[PDB]
Amino acid sequence: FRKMAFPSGKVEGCMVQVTCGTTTLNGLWLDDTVYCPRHVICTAEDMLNPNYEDLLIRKSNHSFLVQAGNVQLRVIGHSMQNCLLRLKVDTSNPKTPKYKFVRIQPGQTFSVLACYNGSPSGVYQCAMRPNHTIKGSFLNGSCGSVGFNIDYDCVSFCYMHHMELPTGVHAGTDLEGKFYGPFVDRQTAQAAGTDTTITLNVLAWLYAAVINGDRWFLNRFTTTLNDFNLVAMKYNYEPLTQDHVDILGPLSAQTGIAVLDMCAALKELLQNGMNGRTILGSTILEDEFTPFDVVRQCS
Amino acid sequence: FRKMAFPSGKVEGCMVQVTCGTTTLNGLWLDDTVYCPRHVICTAEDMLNPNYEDLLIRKSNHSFLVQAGNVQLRVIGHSMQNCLLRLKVDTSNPKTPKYKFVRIQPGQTFSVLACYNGSPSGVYQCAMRPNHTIKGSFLNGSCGSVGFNIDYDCVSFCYMHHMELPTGVHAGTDLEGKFYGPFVDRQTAQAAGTDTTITLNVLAWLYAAVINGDRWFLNRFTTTLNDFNLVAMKYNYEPLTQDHVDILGPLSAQTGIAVLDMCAALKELLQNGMNGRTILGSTILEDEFTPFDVVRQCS
Ligand SMILES: *CC(=O)CNC(=O)OCc1ccccc1
Ligand SMILES: *CC(=O)CNC(=O)OCc1ccccc1
């Protein structure tokens, strides 16, 4: 039916306000550690060409203003962890959930908790683009906002926000501090690669459209899989592996609609276009729903 | 930028599992009270033509299985409150936030917390339709899911889910138990009125599109306001009052684009269509963003 993010509860109790100088951004507070982007130590004009390890030297424990809502936290140690600033604190988080750090593979979706000063503002779901970018909302002071999944009752942190590219797309790192894609914490000529459509997702969403009583785009047409990929190369789509076909199986078996039949339906949708019509109240093709967050939705 | 629901944290700690017989649905737990739909006392075939007050008589305090996660709650009293079942409990909610009950006027948006057995599953934002319906996701056991706003740090409960209409649209009540629109907790021939577009919202979203660097739909054209409404009557749109014009003012003043100019832009968009183009990565016209959750987004 609708695009839905994960419950934000467990992550909300982890959001803190890390301020350094006139720089003030969000941070994640797990046990006696607080993570945030290492550019909090930078000033506006140091984002030109930054010497992070040397700037980090100027700083000492008293330079950081960690604020758990209203409780001000005593920072007892600072250390750089790639692009993230690791801060050992006095008082470990009592609200800390069971957590894991994951580096999600492109095409995978997660929920973002938008924060502006260490208190949550809103929550939405996006997807890791094949060119390693994200399409969210982040104005001033939103760096530090995290991205995550919740399986079972376990929080998998997989994103922190660092920068917006001069085209309106967003870039960041996992919780180890390592960037997704070829980007660096620096304001220089940094382009984004061409984006391709997450084919697998379009297919999964098509099944959800069928689940929901929208089946006009269907046909007794099938496709080889070798020919479909030619059509995909034509329309900036990701190609289809057998591994994509495999766990579309569960979805195929429910609706009794073969995967190759669904590709044939897609193939036609791209080639013919089928104007005026809407799939799940949308003319555009939706690639930000993984198979897993489709089975999960129903139910 | 993106559609974003409110943080679910404060509401999550309020979700409980109210089961009665083979009927099991969600409930809201505030202080020593637990709310849920009064159809939990009904059996499958009692939804045909239900005699609620008479069925409620068959029930006593021991008939209800309230489950705060894993802690089973002792229900000490039952009473009907219009379409909601009010349950006085042993143990009042320690996680209860500051809360208010509101009956939002149509066109207003809120966040839903989807629940399936008294634990939160996902969260998304929708809008109260002019015909008093909602477009969300609710499979079996999702009745009891609530809708809400968070201003300040104060939770305004404004929706609970009751039923899906045989067209895929959703109907429910405020937290007083009074339905939105002409619907009743009963499986009979209950149609939905024709839906109209929330004009005011389209306008606010257009400003956000301008905020975000998308300004192709603009012109030095203006419109009387008396003529625009004629165009609106033509396209199943809500008409424009002076009260709509008034608090589009703040948005108008920021972008320097007059409201009547924006209506002229809309007027053209509906009449001409302007094919192929996308506004904020969408061809469809978006009416589920109120002015308030646009100013709030930025920022
Ligand atoms: C998100 C913030 O409010 C703090 N950072 C910011 O506004 O952008 C600075 C920047 C980071 C990386 C590259 C270029 C500029
Ligand atoms: C949401 C539930 O899982 C419990 N109710 C339900 O499935 O629908 C029953 C019903 C309610 C109102 C009108 C008709 C049928």
XYZ file of C-alpha atoms and ligand atoms in Angstrom:
628
model
C 0.000 0.000 0.000
C 2.152 2.834 1.343
C 5.820 3.634 1.915
C 6.558 3.065 5.598
C 9.632 3.644 7.764
C 10.537 1.631 10.881
C 9.449 2.681 14.389
C 11.913 5.311 15.581
C 11.545 4.686 19.327
C 14.715 2.702 19.966
C 16.890 5.128 17.969
C 15.296 8.270 19.422
C 16.767 7.605 22.897
C 20.206 7.545 21.261
C 20.206 11.014 19.675
C 22.576 13.618 21.115
C 23.759 17.114 20.276
C 27.495 17.341 19.669
C 28.638 20.949 19.368
C 32.193 22.112 18.726
C 32.778 25.895 18.396
C 30.071 27.400 16.172
C 29.566 23.925 14.685
C 26.574 22.043 16.080
C 25.367 18.681 14.685
C 23.688 15.408 15.722
C 25.357 12.335 17.239
C 24.546 8.720 18.119
C 24.912 7.645 21.764
C 25.536 3.919 22.310
C 26.798 2.674 25.682
C 29.700 4.979 26.711
C 30.402 6.083 23.114
C 29.066 8.934 20.990
C 29.476 8.938 17.223
C 29.187 11.920 14.882
C 30.750 13.268 11.673
C 34.393 14.304 12.043
C 33.579 17.628 10.319
C 32.098 19.017 13.569
C 35.636 20.087 14.459
C 35.812 22.012 11.185
C 34.811 25.626 10.732
C 32.915 26.866 7.639
C 36.075 27.803 5.700
C 37.968 24.687 6.813
C 35.568 22.632 4.660
C 37.444 24.027 1.616
C 40.546 21.847 2.081
C 40.575 20.185 5.566
C 43.509 18.647 7.462
C 41.422 16.586 9.894
C 44.140 14.877 11.983
C 45.897 18.238 12.432
C 42.662 20.056 13.358
C 41.786 17.188 15.732
C 45.069 17.949 17.515
C 43.961 21.548 18.310
C 40.971 19.944 20.026
C 40.897 18.386 23.477
C 38.151 16.696 25.564
C 36.726 20.029 26.777
C 36.133 21.261 23.183
C 33.074 18.998 22.773
C 29.580 19.881 24.020
C 27.618 16.601 24.142
C 23.986 17.155 25.216
C 21.662 14.237 25.938
C 18.495 16.307 25.540
C 19.163 18.515 28.559
C 21.661 16.414 30.513
C 25.088 17.658 29.481
C 27.504 14.763 29.026
C 31.113 14.716 30.170
C 33.385 13.675 27.279
C 36.392 11.788 28.688
C 38.209 10.952 25.434
C 38.399 11.647 21.700
C 39.685 9.520 18.793
C 39.238 9.521 15.020
C 37.574 6.499 13.360
C 37.917 7.090 9.599
C 35.315 9.767 8.821
C 33.557 9.476 12.221
C 34.578 11.000 15.539
C 34.500 8.384 18.335
C 33.854 9.985 21.763
C 34.262 7.959 24.950
C 31.898 9.525 27.518
C 31.135 9.636 31.244
C 27.696 8.033 31.787
C 26.843 5.212 29.370
C 23.447 5.256 27.618
C 20.757 3.602 29.768
C 18.318 3.583 26.832
C 20.743 1.724 24.534
C 18.963 -1.023 22.580
C 20.527 -4.220 21.281
C 22.422 -2.940 18.231
C 24.568 -4.008 15.259
C 26.516 -1.983 12.713
C 25.901 -3.007 9.121
C 27.114 -1.729 5.758
C 24.053 -2.221 3.569
C 24.609 -3.210 -0.066
C 23.237 -0.824 -2.724
C 19.552 -1.177 -3.522
C 18.855 -1.989 0.124
C 16.414 0.282 1.961
C 16.545 1.779 5.439
C 14.727 4.300 7.642
C 16.310 7.683 8.371
C 15.653 9.571 11.591
C 15.945 13.244 10.677
C 17.405 15.281 13.561
C 18.133 18.975 14.022
C 19.924 19.511 17.297
C 19.998 16.100 19.019
C 16.207 15.710 19.050
C 14.289 13.756 16.349
C 12.207 15.807 13.903
C 10.747 13.281 11.472
C 11.263 9.832 10.023
C 11.103 8.398 6.505
C 12.367 5.446 4.466
C 14.841 5.679 1.587
C 17.131 3.369 -0.390
C 20.855 3.155 -1.036
C 21.200 4.142 -4.704
C 23.390 2.098 -7.124
C 25.589 5.218 -7.415
C 25.750 5.209 -3.594
C 23.590 8.299 -2.944
C 20.374 8.918 -0.983
C 17.316 11.051 -1.637
C 16.154 12.499 1.705
C 15.657 15.850 3.470
C 18.572 17.425 5.321
C 18.855 21.149 6.056
C 21.401 22.834 8.352
C 22.322 20.753 11.426
C 21.045 17.401 10.096
C 24.468 15.770 9.759
C 24.578 13.113 12.445
C 21.140 11.778 11.498
C 21.293 8.015 11.305
C 19.880 5.290 9.092
C 18.791 1.903 10.354
C 16.774 -1.306 10.232
C 14.883 -3.116 12.995
C 14.769 -6.901 12.714
C 13.322 -8.780 15.706
C 13.947 -5.989 18.272
C 17.522 -5.417 17.180
C 18.755 -2.100 15.739
C 21.047 -2.337 12.721
C 22.738 1.024 12.223
C 23.806 1.375 8.596
C 23.931 5.095 7.825
C 24.995 8.436 9.212
C 24.573 11.662 7.216
C 27.591 13.782 6.255
C 26.947 16.012 3.246
C 24.660 17.119 0.471
C 26.086 17.107 -3.039
C 25.584 20.307 -5.154
C 22.722 18.533 -6.996
C 20.498 17.836 -3.976
C 21.565 14.244 -3.301
C 22.872 13.008 0.021
C 26.067 11.200 0.997
C 27.331 9.538 4.166
C 28.979 6.589 5.866
C 28.238 3.464 7.838
C 28.910 3.581 11.575
C 32.553 2.552 11.067
C 33.125 5.941 9.402
C 33.700 4.524 5.901
C 31.836 6.301 3.099
C 29.329 4.688 0.764
C 30.787 5.191 -2.720
C 33.691 7.456 -3.790
C 32.864 10.551 -1.669
C 34.952 12.316 0.999
C 34.156 14.825 3.803
C 35.270 17.823 1.727
C 33.636 20.645 -0.275
C 35.303 20.115 -3.655
C 34.334 19.134 -7.214
C 32.648 15.851 -6.273
C 30.243 14.534 -8.896
C 27.703 11.750 -8.510
C 27.803 8.811 -10.941
C 24.818 8.154 -13.191
C 21.997 6.527 -11.302
C 20.431 3.260 -12.444
C 17.017 1.878 -11.457
C 16.872 -0.902 -8.868
C 15.231 -3.424 -11.158
C 14.672 -6.048 -8.426
C 12.674 -3.539 -6.410
C 10.446 -2.465 -9.320
C 9.597 -6.157 -9.716
C 8.810 -6.610 -6.001
C 6.629 -3.497 -6.027
C 4.844 -4.851 -9.105
C 3.996 -7.973 -7.106
C 2.650 -5.700 -4.338
C 0.565 -3.917 -6.975
C -0.855 -7.347 -7.938
C -1.318 -8.220 -4.244
C -3.411 -5.020 -4.007
C -5.728 -5.667 -6.987
C -3.858 -3.844 -9.762
C -3.052 -6.292 -12.555
C -3.549 -4.397 -15.856
C 0.186 -4.422 -16.672
C 0.154 -8.234 -16.882
C 0.210 -10.559 -19.922
C 0.758 -14.189 -21.016
C 4.007 -12.781 -22.446
C 7.264 -14.085 -21.029
C 10.913 -13.117 -21.537
C 14.175 -15.075 -21.792
C 15.965 -13.085 -19.056
C 18.817 -12.679 -21.547
C 16.638 -10.353 -23.664
C 15.123 -8.487 -20.733
C 18.593 -7.301 -19.690
C 19.048 -5.785 -23.164
C 15.879 -3.741 -22.563
C 17.294 -2.806 -19.130
C 20.637 -1.603 -20.555
C 18.509 0.630 -22.804
C 16.588 2.316 -19.955
C 19.333 2.856 -17.308
C 18.092 -0.181 -15.337
C 20.218 -2.616 -13.332
C 20.503 -6.042 -15.026
C 18.887 -9.183 -13.550
C 20.938 -11.956 -11.959
C 19.629 -15.427 -11.098
C 19.973 -14.319 -7.468
C 17.358 -11.630 -8.143
C 15.067 -14.263 -9.662
C 15.566 -16.588 -6.683
C 13.998 -14.606 -3.788
C 11.349 -13.112 -6.023
C 10.277 -16.763 -5.874
C 8.386 -16.465 -2.558
C 6.533 -13.464 -4.029
C 5.957 -15.310 -7.313
C 4.535 -18.370 -5.543
C 1.973 -16.302 -3.601
C 0.504 -14.519 -6.646
C 1.099 -17.531 -8.916
C 2.791 -15.120 -11.333
C 6.146 -16.317 -12.672
C 9.135 -13.970 -12.294
C 9.977 -14.045 -16.035
C 6.307 -13.172 -16.675
C 6.725 -10.148 -14.403
C 9.870 -9.105 -16.292
C 7.868 -9.431 -19.508
C 5.302 -7.128 -17.868
C 8.092 -4.688 -16.941
C 9.763 -4.999 -20.357
C 6.448 -3.925 -21.892
C 5.918 -1.105 -19.358
C 9.290 0.427 -20.285
C 8.971 -0.118 -24.063
C 5.279 0.689 -24.566
C 4.891 3.050 -21.590
C 1.134 2.508 -21.121
C 0.186 6.186 -20.668
C -2.364 7.703 -18.283
C -2.554 4.573 -16.130
C -1.367 4.406 -12.523
C 0.268 1.532 -10.664
C -0.543 1.851 -6.946
C -1.678 5.455 -7.568
C 1.562 6.413 -9.328
C 2.636 6.772 -12.968
C 6.351 6.641 -12.124
C 8.135 3.308 -11.549
C 8.947 2.691 -7.880
C 12.340 1.188 -7.074
C 12.599 2.041 -3.369
C 10.794 -1.072 -2.082
C 12.967 -4.175 -1.627
C 11.305 -7.624 -1.810
C 11.792 -7.921 1.948
C 9.961 -4.694 2.797
C 7.035 -5.931 0.686
C 6.568 -9.382 2.252
C 6.928 -7.569 5.598
C 4.197 -5.054 4.720
C 1.692 -7.828 3.883
C 2.319 -9.074 6.426
C 12.007 17.016 -0.177
C 10.411 13.817 1.122
C 7.231 12.697 2.870
C 8.044 12.248 6.553
C 6.051 10.959 9.528
C 6.566 12.040 13.155
C 8.894 10.177 15.541
C 6.964 7.197 16.883
C 8.818 6.846 20.199
C 6.274 8.420 22.532
C 3.356 6.481 21.005
C 5.222 3.161 20.837
C 5.285 2.819 24.653
C 1.488 3.114 24.588
C 0.671 0.182 22.291
C -1.074 -2.833 23.821
C -2.682 -6.049 22.641
C -6.359 -6.316 23.527
C -7.724 -9.778 22.777
C -11.301 -10.927 23.316
C -12.174 -14.521 22.275
C -10.655 -15.246 18.853
C -10.591 -11.482 18.247
C -7.193 -9.866 18.780
C -6.455 -6.196 17.947
C -4.327 -3.218 19.045
C -5.087 -0.741 21.841
C -3.798 2.560 23.234
C -2.632 2.630 26.868
C -2.785 6.046 28.564
C -2.539 6.301 32.357
C -4.917 3.653 33.814
C -7.046 3.485 30.637
C -6.817 1.361 27.496
C -8.684 2.314 24.340
C -9.509 0.062 21.388
C -12.286 -0.490 18.831
C -15.536 -1.784 20.329
C -15.654 -4.496 17.625
C -13.085 -6.598 19.541
C -16.035 -8.055 21.447
C -17.597 -9.069 18.132
C -17.057 -12.382 16.399
C -16.611 -12.670 12.601
C -20.327 -13.243 11.902
C -21.451 -10.631 14.440
C -19.991 -7.959 12.128
C -22.992 -8.616 9.827
C -25.532 -6.805 12.031
C -24.088 -6.109 15.543
C -25.943 -5.279 18.775
C -22.955 -3.810 20.626
C -24.525 -2.853 23.986
C -26.142 -6.306 24.204
C -22.910 -8.123 23.267
C -21.010 -5.926 25.756
C -23.355 -7.303 28.429
C -22.222 -10.919 27.755
C -18.714 -9.655 28.500
C -17.195 -9.045 31.915
C -13.759 -7.808 33.105
C -12.155 -11.259 32.744
C -13.101 -11.480 29.023
C -10.335 -9.025 28.039
C -6.688 -10.009 27.525
C -4.661 -6.771 27.708
C -0.937 -7.385 27.072
C 1.639 -4.632 27.546
C 4.271 -6.352 25.404
C 4.733 -9.302 27.754
C 3.331 -7.920 31.010
C -0.286 -9.038 31.134
C -2.523 -6.261 32.442
C -5.376 -6.711 34.890
C -8.545 -5.080 33.514
C -10.642 -3.792 36.435
C -13.549 -2.239 34.506
C -15.240 -1.950 31.112
C -17.453 0.786 29.612
C -18.537 1.790 26.112
C -17.503 5.225 24.776
C -19.339 5.614 21.446
C -17.408 3.378 19.035
C -14.435 2.870 21.409
C -14.141 0.483 24.340
C -12.820 2.283 27.452
C -10.958 -0.115 29.800
C -9.960 0.988 33.294
C -6.861 -1.060 34.214
C -4.693 -2.093 37.165
C -1.238 -0.501 36.698
C -1.259 2.894 34.964
C 1.158 3.492 32.065
C 4.566 4.676 33.325
C 5.641 5.590 29.777
C 2.609 7.847 29.196
C 3.618 11.100 27.484
C 1.845 14.434 27.790
C -1.170 13.889 25.520
C -4.255 15.574 24.029
C -7.159 14.176 22.033
C -7.961 16.129 18.891
C -10.474 15.705 16.077
C -8.508 16.915 13.065
C -10.403 18.782 10.341
C -10.327 17.248 6.836
C -7.246 17.997 4.767
C -5.120 17.871 7.913
C -2.279 15.337 7.975
C -1.104 12.983 10.701
C 1.297 10.080 11.267
C -0.050 6.543 11.657
C 1.723 3.922 13.742
C 0.892 0.602 12.099
C 0.585 -2.191 14.688
C -0.102 -5.912 14.422
C -0.477 -7.378 17.877
C 0.324 -4.541 20.309
C 3.832 -3.965 18.937
C 4.628 -1.275 16.306
C 5.456 -2.503 12.795
C 5.970 0.644 10.732
C 5.113 4.317 10.556
C 3.944 6.622 7.766
C 2.140 9.929 7.237
C -1.280 10.318 5.621
C -4.036 12.932 5.386
C -7.693 13.103 6.346
C -9.515 13.086 2.996
C -12.370 15.565 2.262
C -14.671 12.513 2.066
C -13.305 11.520 5.498
C -11.237 8.490 4.412
C -7.546 7.559 4.706
C -5.118 5.840 2.366
C -2.810 3.640 4.472
C -1.839 -0.022 4.960
C -3.864 -2.181 7.335
C -4.036 -5.978 7.127
C -5.553 -8.338 9.720
C -5.067 -7.181 13.333
C -4.240 -3.534 12.526
C -7.422 -2.061 14.008
C -6.314 -0.203 17.107
C -3.464 1.519 15.259
C -3.475 5.188 16.127
C -2.907 8.467 14.327
C -1.224 11.465 15.887
C 0.752 14.700 15.815
C 3.679 15.831 17.970
C 3.878 19.560 18.661
C 6.492 20.672 21.212
C 6.782 17.281 22.994
C 3.041 16.818 23.299
C 1.160 13.927 21.656
C -2.124 14.814 19.967
C -4.054 11.611 19.324
C -6.488 12.155 16.461
C -7.111 8.763 14.865
C -7.720 5.123 15.640
C -8.300 2.555 12.877
C -11.563 0.595 12.674
C -12.286 -0.738 9.190
C -11.348 -0.959 5.553
C -14.044 -0.114 3.029
C -14.596 -2.623 0.136
C -12.605 -0.277 -2.159
C -9.333 -0.268 -0.198
C -9.847 2.961 1.752
C -9.663 3.219 5.516
C -12.107 4.534 8.111
C -11.919 5.244 11.834
C -12.596 7.555 14.750
C -10.965 10.096 17.005
C -10.109 8.976 20.533
C -13.593 9.901 21.794
C -14.961 7.035 19.674
C -16.797 9.279 17.186
C -16.294 8.395 13.518
C -14.833 10.694 10.888
C -17.575 11.035 8.266
C -20.785 8.970 7.884
C -19.357 5.480 8.622
C -20.311 2.972 11.340
C -18.609 -0.133 12.843
C -20.616 -2.544 10.676
C -20.065 -4.656 7.533
C -22.902 -3.358 5.353
C -23.369 -1.434 2.090
C -21.271 1.578 3.104
C -20.032 3.661 0.184
C -17.399 6.383 0.241
C -18.292 9.844 -1.096
C -16.411 11.224 -4.090
C -12.988 12.456 -3.120
C -11.826 15.989 -3.897
C -8.231 17.252 -4.020
C -6.921 19.267 -1.074
C -6.184 22.383 -3.086
C -4.447 24.234 -0.219
C -1.955 21.400 0.114
C -1.123 21.243 -3.611
C -0.300 24.952 -3.337
C 1.917 24.466 -0.258
C 3.736 21.590 -1.953
C 4.227 23.794 -5.019
C 5.966 26.331 -2.782
C 8.172 23.493 -1.469
C 8.942 22.573 -5.079
C 10.050 26.208 -5.598
C 11.984 26.115 -2.302
C 13.822 23.084 -3.753
C 14.802 24.608 -7.127
C 11.890 23.469 -9.304
C 10.179 26.510 -10.809
C 9.224 25.569 -14.406
C 5.479 25.600 -13.639
C 5.633 29.332 -12.847
C 4.505 32.360 -14.898
C 3.768 36.114 -14.702
C 0.147 34.950 -15.041
C -2.206 35.662 -12.165
C -5.805 34.660 -11.419
C -8.789 36.436 -9.844
C -9.456 33.709 -7.242
C -13.078 33.809 -8.413
C -12.046 32.235 -11.745
C -9.599 29.758 -10.247
C -12.432 28.154 -8.264
C -14.307 27.570 -11.537
C -11.276 25.616 -12.793
C -11.265 23.745 -9.452
C -14.960 22.773 -9.696
C -14.021 21.321 -13.100
C -11.226 19.061 -11.789
C -12.723 17.702 -8.511
C -10.639 20.186 -6.477
C -11.662 21.896 -3.237
C -12.406 25.624 -3.726
C -10.168 28.357 -2.250
C -11.267 30.505 0.684
C -9.537 33.700 1.826
C -8.475 31.670 4.871
C -6.493 29.395 2.543
C -4.849 32.453 0.982
C -4.001 33.894 4.408
C -1.526 31.316 5.822
C -0.064 30.601 2.417
C 1.178 34.142 3.073
C 4.207 33.097 5.167
C 5.160 30.687 2.359
C 4.488 33.351 -0.283
C 6.660 35.919 1.508
C 9.664 33.561 1.667
C 9.708 32.714 -2.059
C 8.428 36.174 -3.041
C 5.789 34.385 -5.126
C 2.249 35.704 -4.667
C -0.470 33.179 -3.760
C -2.718 34.177 -6.702
C 0.344 33.702 -8.946
C 0.696 30.174 -7.564
C -2.992 29.488 -8.254
C -2.412 30.747 -11.795
C 0.463 28.240 -11.964
C -1.860 25.494 -10.678
C -4.728 26.591 -12.944
C -2.355 26.134 -15.888
C -1.021 22.786 -14.598
C -4.562 21.366 -14.477
C -5.735 22.891 -17.790
C -2.594 22.445 -19.904
C -1.189 19.416 -18.050
C 2.470 20.023 -18.984
C 3.317 16.411 -19.914
C 6.516 14.468 -19.217
C 7.713 16.937 -16.583
C 8.061 16.096 -12.893
C 7.456 18.295 -9.862
C 9.654 17.066 -6.991
C 10.251 13.815 -8.924
C 6.532 13.171 -9.441
C 4.087 13.712 -12.315
C 1.023 13.415 -10.067
C -0.203 16.382 -7.988
C 0.538 15.980 -4.275
C -2.170 17.034 -1.832
C -0.988 15.235 1.313
C 1.346 18.000 2.541
C -0.296 20.755 4.608
C 1.344 24.219 4.684
C 2.402 23.503 8.265
C 4.240 20.271 7.449
C 6.154 22.172 4.753
C 7.391 25.118 6.844
C 8.285 22.480 9.462
C 10.304 20.433 6.955
C 12.421 23.462 5.946
C 12.921 23.969 8.758
C 25.051 18.866 8.390
C 25.645 20.131 9.085
O 24.837 20.953 9.415
C 27.095 20.277 9.393
N 27.757 20.195 7.960
C 27.333 20.910 6.851
O 26.377 21.758 6.864
O 28.054 20.672 5.566
C 29.539 20.839 5.699
C 30.208 19.965 4.665
C 30.411 18.607 4.927
C 31.028 17.797 3.975
C 31.441 18.351 2.766
C 31.235 19.705 2.499
C 30.616 20.515 3.450
C -8.667 -4.722 12.229
C -9.006 -6.155 12.747
O -8.179 -6.988 12.505
C -10.221 -6.455 13.555
N -11.391 -6.040 12.575
C -11.480 -6.418 11.246
O -10.645 -7.187 10.659
O -12.637 -5.894 10.460
C -13.954 -6.170 11.122
C -14.930 -5.096 10.703
C -14.937 -3.866 11.368
C -15.836 -2.871 10.984
C -16.723 -3.114 9.938
C -16.714 -4.338 9.270
C -15.815 -5.333 9.652
